[PDB]
C-alpha cells in the first residue's frame, strides 16, 4: 500500500540517458544523487499545486488538466495534454 524509498527507482542509466539527450559527454559520479534531489524537489512542487487544484474541484482523482494547470502556474506550459 504505502511506498517508502522509490526515489531510487530513477536508476543511474536513466539519468545517464537524460544527460545524453542534453548533450553531456562525461558525467561525474556524484551527479546522480544531486539529480535525484533536484527531480524530487521539482516533483513535489508540481504535485502540490496539482493536488491543490484537485482538492478545490472536490474531486479525488488527479486529472491531467490539473497537472497542466500546475505546470502553467510555474511558467512551464505543456502542450499535448491540454483539453
Amino acid at each position: 500500500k504505502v511506498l517508502r524509498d522509490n526515489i531510487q527507482g530513477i536508476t543511474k542509466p536513466a539519468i545517464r540517458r537524460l544527460a545524453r539527450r542534453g548533450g553531456v559527454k562525461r558525467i561525474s559520479g556524484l551527479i546522480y544523487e544531486e539529480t535525484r534531489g533536484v527531480l524530487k524537489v521539482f516533483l513535489e512542487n508540481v504535485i502540490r499545486d496539482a493536488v491543490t487544484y484537485t482538492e478545490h474541484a472536490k474531486r479525488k482523482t488527479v486529472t491531467a488538466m490539473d497537472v497542466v494547470y500546475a505546470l502553467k502556474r510555474q511558467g512551464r506550459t505543456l502542450y499535448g495534454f491540454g483539453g
Binding site: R21, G23, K25, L71, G75, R76, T77, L78, Y79, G80
Partner: protein, 109 residues
C-alpha cells in the same frame, strides 16, 4: 423574411471560427463589451500563426520522408525558427525531443 445566413468567417474570408472566438471572448470575462471587429482580428491572427507553424512543420516532415506531421516535426519547426522559438521559449512540446546539437569542444580531435 430572413436572408440566407452567412458565417462571419466566410464574410471575413477566414478558415477559423469568428463566432466561436467571439463567444469565447464574451464568456472569458475579458471585457464588459466586445467590439465587432475584435473576434475577426483575433481569428485572423490565430489562423496566420497556425498557417506559419503548419508550413514549417510540413517542410520538416517532408525533409524526414514522413507524410503525416507528428510532435517531433512540430518541435523541429518551432526550434529552428528564431521568431517562433522566442514566442514559444517557455513551452514544452510533449514527445517533441530536442534539436540535435553537440558542443564543438566535445567532438574528438
Amino acid at each position: 423574411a430572413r436572408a440566407k445566413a452567412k458565417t462571419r468567417s466566410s464574410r471575413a474570408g477566414l478558415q477559423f471560427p469568428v463566432g466561436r472566438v467571439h463567444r469565447l471572448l464574451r464568456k472569458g470575462n475579458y471585457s464588459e463589451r466586445v467590439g465587432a471587429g475584435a473576434p475577426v482580428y483575433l481569428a485572423a491572427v490565430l489562423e496566420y500563426l497556425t498557417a506559419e507553424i503548419l508550413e514549417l512543420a510540413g517542410n520538416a516532415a517532408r525533409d524526414n520522408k514522413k507524410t503525416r506531421i507528428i510532435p517531433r516535426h512540430l518541435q523541429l519547426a518551432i526550434r529552428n525558427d528564431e521568431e517562433l522559438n522566442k514566442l514559444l521559449g517557455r513551452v514544452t512540446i510533449a514527445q517533441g525531443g530536442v534539436l540535435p546539437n553537440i558542443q564543438a569542444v566535445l567532438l574528438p580531435k
